[PDB]
Design an enzyme around this catalytic site. Sequence first.
Site, mmCIF file in Angstrom:
data_model
loop_
_atom_site.group_PDB
_atom_site.id
_atom_site.type_symbol
_atom_site.label_atom_id
_atom_site.label_comp_id
_atom_site.label_asym_id
_atom_site.label_seq_id
_atom_site.Cartn_x
_atom_site.Cartn_y
_atom_site.Cartn_z
ATOM 1 N N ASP A 5 -26.406 6.691 -25.321
ATOM 2 C CA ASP A 5 -24.988 6.563 -25.631
ATOM 3 C C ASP A 5 -24.420 7.923 -26.015
ATOM 4 O O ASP A 5 -24.583 8.374 -27.153
ATOM 5 C CB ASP A 5 -24.783 5.549 -26.749
ATOM 6 N N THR A 6 -23.746 8.569 -25.063
ATOM 7 C CA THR A 6 -23.060 9.818 -25.359
ATOM 8 C C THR A 6 -21.862 9.606 -26.274
ATOM 9 O O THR A 6 -21.416 10.558 -26.922
ATOM 10 C CB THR A 6 -22.610 10.485 -24.061
ATOM 11 N N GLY A 7 -21.334 8.388 -26.341
ATOM 12 C CA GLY A 7 -20.247 8.075 -27.242
ATOM 13 C C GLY A 7 -20.656 7.769 -28.661
ATOM 14 O O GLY A 7 -19.794 7.480 -29.496
HETATM 15 C C1 LIG Z 1 -16.171 3.452 -31.005
HETATM 16 C C2 LIG Z 1 -16.708 4.383 -29.882
HETATM 17 C C3 LIG Z 1 -16.878 5.866 -30.346
HETATM 18 C C4 LIG Z 1 -17.964 3.782 -29.223
HETATM 19 N N1 LIG Z 1 -19.303 4.038 -29.818
HETATM 20 C C5 LIG Z 1 -20.445 4.153 -28.780
HETATM 21 C C6 LIG Z 1 -20.166 3.290 -27.500
HETATM 22 O O1 LIG Z 1 -21.086 3.612 -26.517
HETATM 23 C C7 LIG Z 1 -20.237 1.793 -27.842
HETATM 24 C C8 LIG Z 1 -21.688 1.332 -27.904
HETATM 25 C C9 LIG Z 1 -21.815 -0.191 -27.921
HETATM 26 C C10 LIG Z 1 -22.366 -0.863 -26.806
HETATM 27 C C11 LIG Z 1 -22.485 -2.257 -26.821
HETATM 28 C C12 LIG Z 1 -22.064 -2.970 -27.921
HETATM 29 C C13 LIG Z 1 -21.521 -2.299 -29.031
HETATM 30 C C14 LIG Z 1 -21.396 -0.900 -29.018
HETATM 31 N N2 LIG Z 1 -19.572 1.040 -26.797
HETATM 32 C C15 LIG Z 1 -18.269 0.367 -26.973
HETATM 33 O O2 LIG Z 1 -17.862 0.005 -28.031
HETATM 34 O O3 LIG Z 1 -17.572 0.163 -25.783
HETATM 35 C C16 LIG Z 1 -16.991 -1.092 -25.489
HETATM 36 C C17 LIG Z 1 -16.047 -0.745 -24.134
HETATM 37 O O4 LIG Z 1 -16.889 -0.908 -23.091
HETATM 38 C C18 LIG Z 1 -17.747 -2.161 -23.529
HETATM 39 O O5 LIG Z 1 -18.943 -2.037 -23.171
HETATM 40 C C19 LIG Z 1 -19.826 -2.544 -24.441
HETATM 41 C C20 LIG Z 1 -19.193 -2.054 -25.491
HETATM 42 C C21 LIG Z 1 -17.747 -2.115 -25.122
HETATM 43 S S1 LIG Z 1 -19.780 3.201 -31.278
HETATM 44 O O6 LIG Z 1 -20.609 2.006 -30.951
HETATM 45 O O7 LIG Z 1 -18.660 2.557 -31.941
HETATM 46 C C22 LIG Z 1 -20.714 4.276 -32.451
HETATM 47 C C23 LIG Z 1 -20.051 4.949 -33.435
HETATM 48 C C24 LIG Z 1 -20.758 5.758 -34.326
HETATM 49 C C25 LIG Z 1 -22.134 5.875 -34.214
HETATM 50 N N3 LIG Z 1 -22.887 6.743 -35.170
HETATM 51 C C26 LIG Z 1 -22.804 5.192 -33.222
HETATM 52 C C27 LIG Z 1 -22.104 4.392 -32.341
#
Ligand SMILES: CC(C)CN(C[C@@H](O)[C@H](Cc1ccccc1)NC(=O)O[C@H]1CO[C@H]2OCC[C@H]21)S(=O)(=O)c1ccc(N)cc1
Lengths: 99, 99
Positions: free
Chosen positions: A25-27
């Site tokens: 997860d690059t995000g």
């Molecule tokens: C809020 C963003 C900066 C997204 N982030 C990483 C991201 O990859 C998440 C990672 C992620 C993946 C699955 C479930 C929850 C979180 N994906 C996400 O929320 O994207 C959504 C839009 O596309 C959909 O696909 C699934 C998630 C949906 S995050 O989960 O919130 C995050 C924030 C801080 C840290 N330290 C670690 C992770």
Amino acid sequence: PQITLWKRPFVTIKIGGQLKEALLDTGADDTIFEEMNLPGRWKPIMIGGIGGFIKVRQYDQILIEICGHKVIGTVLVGPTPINVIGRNLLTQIGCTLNF
Amino acid sequence: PQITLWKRPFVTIKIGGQLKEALLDTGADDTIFEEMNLPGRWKPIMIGGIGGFIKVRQYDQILIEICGHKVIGTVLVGPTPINVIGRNLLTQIGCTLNF
Ligand SMILES: CC(C)CN(C[C@@H](O)[C@H](Cc1ccccc1)NC(=O)O[C@H]1CO[C@H]2OCC[C@H]21)S(=O)(=O)c1ccc(N)cc1
């Protein structure tokens, strides 16, 4: 390896003697795992995301073997719907985005 | 270009005539943007992430120019804390992870 993104970039990882799959997860600034058995002391923290915030346990200097690559960094454990490898550890294996 | 992950991988994009920065998010299945003026019809849906879910407006076949690369795909608009480019569009610019 070079990984395309037509499917979720999951990799196999070894952490605390346990086998798990985690999402490259690059995000994600930091690495977080679903609830799991890890030894030692920990500090409560809260992280934020798309749906709001979750309370997680912060562990420092945790050894992970990511696809046969050993790394040591901070690992959060909490109610994430998915295990995520964050940038804090991706840098250590020299991971890059390319296009 | 090749992008390391010591910093948040933000890129500049043009969408709906507006300039914005978005996070190259391999952990995001789909692309979502903060509240913005986008033309056309839309379908209400809910997506899920860390801390829960958010209600977003789904727009299909939306043109984005990602760092000088033109792509057309689904773009969600809603209360995300950050604009993220999801895999639905990363695949079209041929983006890959490498380590
Ligand atoms: C809020 C963003 C900066 C997204 N982030 C990483 C991201 O990859 C998440 C990672 C992620 C993946 C699955 C479930 C929850 C979180 N994906 C996400 O929320 O994207 C959504 C839009 O596309 C959909 O696909 C699934 C998630 C949906 S995050 O989960 O919130 C995050 C924030 C801080 C840290 N330290 C670690 C992770």
